[PDB]
DNA sequence: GTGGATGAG
DNA sequence: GCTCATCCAC
């Protein structure tokens, strides 16, 4: 073309951490850390990837490493029914606390698979532990937002990054990068470099054609091209390169000073960032061109309902709402609304005023079925783009055991449970304060139980700190009254033993 | 006040 | 399955 299709101001855009997203030029990643839980076993453990590791709990497998996958094995099978796929299986099962003790603990060689009665963890008096997985996503979570000044925490093993700072920074002041041993980008960027330090340009310019030289710079991982297109056209290209690169060095990171190997999908908005990252696993990396963003949804292997907040109940719902056959109904959507999202939005108005319609269990709101159409509409071009935006405060945090046999026939068996849950809570707390930099206490309490005939009992109250900080042993005590009180509450009526007790504690002061 | 619904997968 | 924090019709 006569010049790039994208304007100064969209290039700079990107050195704007509350709007680098929004430009057409974002360069997203999103990094999962697979089969995560059997990971940080692994890892525990001194074993290797290529080791065909399982995450237990009990019966059944809540991890499933790749190597184990190699035999047909998955979250579905029991243990006993993995073994039959692979004998040589290393099952390991996950901490444990034990009912009346205030810490966790690994019994290695102990489990359900093991057929020595001397070496069971046994259900009725023990609770699992997630501690380490917590800890271990806490040291990956530090090594990212070393890394990158934007990192959203999406989940426990998933981050998604804002590359925007470090790919325009590269591309306009990395005076050490070099394409091949001859060339170097400061030489193959030199009349970009220097229009931008000129301040000449308007920022509704646009920019000038990228030129030859860079042509030749790569992408590092698996570009999805299924219809050989050019690899470098135009800066949105140029960009998703260099953070391609910065992001393998991220990854090895992870991979150097952790161990663990991960998927990252590359792309200018989150949502297609996620798909790309599930697209090849594990420790794999795909980018996904703006050019190709349809080549990329209309592969075969995704749907509307692949998106995001679109894997449940909504998803098909929407699928009947908007009459979308069972293939090809990201395609579908973008052809049957060609033009602007208003269509779409009235063609929702109009089903909301369906005869069918049910407004009483609809997870559609009909006062905000503008926004509705325009996530649908850029979805299905790959255009959503939404910020990284930070987990907001926890409300509520909850520790509980299902009882079953007599495990709970008194108030001393409550007391057992009850100092488990706070050694639990204690340390969610602690990582809390890591997350937020900032103390968190709770100012209430909750315990609540079901009763041998599943009614729930239930007393809140406030937790008073003799000092300034929180102590465990005062959450304790509350829980201790509470119980104790429910007791006196329930005594010529269904009771004991109990099925479920659980503290949850909230109103939460960060300060 | 909260049981049950909701999201990944 | 199942886990979890969170939201809101009842
Ligand atoms: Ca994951
Ligand atoms: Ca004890
Ligand atoms: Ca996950
Ligand atoms: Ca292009």
């Known amino acids: 073309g006569r010049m790039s299709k994208f304007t100064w101001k969209e290039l700079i855009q990107l050195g704007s951490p509350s709007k680098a997203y929004e430009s057409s030029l974002a360069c997203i990643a999103h990094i999962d850390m697979n089969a995560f839980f059997a990971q940080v076993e692994q890892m525990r453990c001194g074993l290797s990837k290529e080791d065909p590791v399982v995450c237990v709990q009990w019966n059944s497998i809540i991890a499933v490493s790749y190597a184990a996958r190699k035999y047909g094995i998955s979250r579905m099978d029991t243990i006993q029914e993995a073994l039959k796929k692979c004998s040589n299986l290393i099952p390991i099962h996950t901490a444990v606390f034990k009912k009346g003790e205030d810490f966790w603990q690994y019994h290695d060689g102990c489990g359900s698979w093991v057929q020595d009665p001397a070496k069971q963890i046994s259900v009725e008096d023990h609770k699992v532990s997630l501690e380490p997985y917590r800890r271990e996503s806490r040291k990956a979570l530090k090594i990212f937002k070393s890394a990158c000044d934007l990192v959203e925490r999406a989940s426990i093993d998933e981050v998604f990054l804002d590359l925007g700072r470090i790919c325009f920074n590269m591309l306009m002041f990395d005076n050490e990068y070099e394409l091949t041993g001859d060339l170097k980008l400061k030489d193959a960027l030199s009349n970009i470099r220097e229009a931008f330090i000129g301040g000449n340009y308007d920022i509704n310019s646009h920019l000038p054609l990228i030129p030859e030289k860079i042509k030749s710079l790569k992408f590092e991982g698996d570009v999805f091209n299924p219809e050989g297109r050019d690899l470098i056209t135009d800066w949105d290209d140029v960009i998703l390169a260099l953070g391609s690169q910065v992001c393998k060095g991220i990854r090895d990171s992870i ?59 909504l998803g098909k719902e929407l699928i009947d709402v908007l009459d979308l056959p069972h293939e090809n109904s990201i395609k579908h959507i973008r052809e049957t609304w060609p033009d602007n999202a208003g269509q779409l939005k ?41 910020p990284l935006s930070s987990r907001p405060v926890v409300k509520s945090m909850m520790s509980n055991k299902n009882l079953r046999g007599k495990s709970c026939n008194s108030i001393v068996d409550c007391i057992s449970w009850l100092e488990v849950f706070c050694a639990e809570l204690t340390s969610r707390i602690q990582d809390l304060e890591q997350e937020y930099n900032k103390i968190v206490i709770p100012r209430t309490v909750s315990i609540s139980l079901k009763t041998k005939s599943y009614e ?8 008073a700190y003799k000092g300034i900080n929180f102590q465990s042993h005062e959450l304790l005590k509350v829980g201790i009254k509470f119980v104790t009180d429910l007791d006196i509450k329930g005594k010529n009526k269904s009771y004991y033993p109990l099925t479920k007790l659980s503290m949850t504690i909230t109103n939460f002061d960060i300060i």
């Open 456 to 463: 729930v009992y239930r007393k809140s109250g406030p937790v």
């Open 346 to 386: 009235e063609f929702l108005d109009a089903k909301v005023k369906q005869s069918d319609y049910d407004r009483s269990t609809s997870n559609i709101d009909p006062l905000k079925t503008a926004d509705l159409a325009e996530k649908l509409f850029k979805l299905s071009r790959g255009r959503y783009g939404l």
């Open 255 to 313: 991979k150097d000073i952790l161990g663990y190997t991960t998927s990252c999908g590359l792309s200018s908005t989150k949502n297609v960032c996620k798909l790309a990252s599930n697209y090849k696993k594990p420790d794999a990396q795909t980018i996904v061109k703006n050019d190709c963003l349809l080549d990329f949804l209309d592969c075969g292997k995704f749907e509307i309902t692949s998106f995001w907040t679109l894997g449940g109940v």
